[PDB]
């Protein structure tokens, strides 16, 4: 049997360090998306950042860069501060979810 | 003040529901305005709903709202694995959150 669910591309950096103010990019590649949708969340406080093409957070520093049909769901974090350091999760809305964790560090 | 400053009207009411029955988790907000209300499963950190769209592919989950103030998430045919904490979120800056517990018997 094969459910033909989506799957991640693990060949991406998952521990990213940027200097304060330097823009950070988190690369989540999802193949065979089908009818599913990809989301970015901030694990520390369970804050939804983006869901599909739409941005949920009102923090204008967060945007998801994805061209139509592409597998790349890059989370862009402009003007990062040390407060932004922590774990960010790329999750797929399957039942149960699929998730891939990313560590983001902002250095002074 | 900001002309639109959404706030939680009341804390979420804990709910207990027997297996196979429906349960409803209600989040009450004031002055939502252009902002968005979301429901999440805390234990698994899973996005369930955003506004009137169900995000999870769990077909047992639906969302309804009354006057953009009451945001009621419904869970059909409860499984014992549904027991746990659920979060209601508003996309303000900073974001606002409150949690309620669904107990299953
Ligand atoms: C909502 O419910 C949760 C969980 O309680 C569960 O659901 C209810 C509807 C009832 O059916 C309960 O019988 C059922 O277990 C409440 O959270 C719980 O809070 C208590 C403390 O208020 C925690 O109790 C323990 O306290 C002892 C010391 O007295 C410690 O040793 C323990 O480590 C623990 O702290 C309990 O763990 C906690 N349960 C969970 C799952 O988090 C919650 O307070 C309630 N909310 C409201 C508004 O009623
Ligand atoms: C994630 O990486 C951090 C730091 O990584 C740094 O940058 C990388 C590009 C690489 O060059 C590493 O060798 C660098 O150290 C690790 O965290 C520690 O972080 C503290 C402050 O955050 C720093 O002072 C320490 O020097 C870092 N320790 C080491 C050994 O790098 C962290 O352990 C990594 N986490 C995971 C899960 O891999």
Author numbering:
A (entry chain A): 48 to 155
B (entry chain B): 38 to 142
Text taken from the publication that reported this structure:
We chose complexes of Dpr1 and Dpr11, as they are reported to have neuronal phenotypes, and therefore these complex structures can be directly used to investigate the relationship between Dpr–DIP interactions and the observed phenotypes. We crystallized and solved the structures of Dpr1 IG1 with DIP-η IG1, and Dpr11 IG1 with DIP-γ IG1 +2. However, one method, the statistical coupling analysis (SCA) version 5, identified one pair of amino acids, Dpr His94 (Dpr1) and DIP Met132 (DIP-η). These two residues directly contact each other and cap the hydrophobic interior of the interface. With these data, we first investigated the His94 (Dpr1) to Glu126 (DIP-η) hydrogen bond, which appeared to be the only conserved side chain-to-side chain hydrogen bond among the three heterophilic complexes based on sequence conservation. For the Dpr1–DIP-η and Dpr6–DIP-α complexes, His-to-Ala mutation unexpectedly increased affinity despite removing a hydrogen bond and significant packing. Overall, it appears that Dpr–DIP specificity is encoded not only by relationships between pairs of Dpr and DIP residues (e.g., K144 in Dpr1 with T83 in DIP-η, Figure 3d1), but also through coupling of multiple residues, and through shape complementarity, where rotameric changes help create complementary surfaces. The main chain positions of a DIP-η bound to either another DIP-η or Dpr1 are virtually identical, and surprisingly, most side chains also preserve their rotameric states. We believe that interdomain flexibility and long low-complexity ‘stalk’ regions linking the IG domains to the membrane would enable cis dimerization for homodimeric DIPs, such as DIP-α and DIP-η. In fact, our SPR experiments where DIP-η is captured on solid support at high densities reports much higher apparent KD values for the Dpr1–DIP-η interaction (23 µM vs 4.0 µM measured when non-dimerizing Dpr1 is captured on SPR chip; Figure 4—figure supplements 1,3), as the cis DIP-η homodimer formation on the chip likely competes with Dpr1 binding.
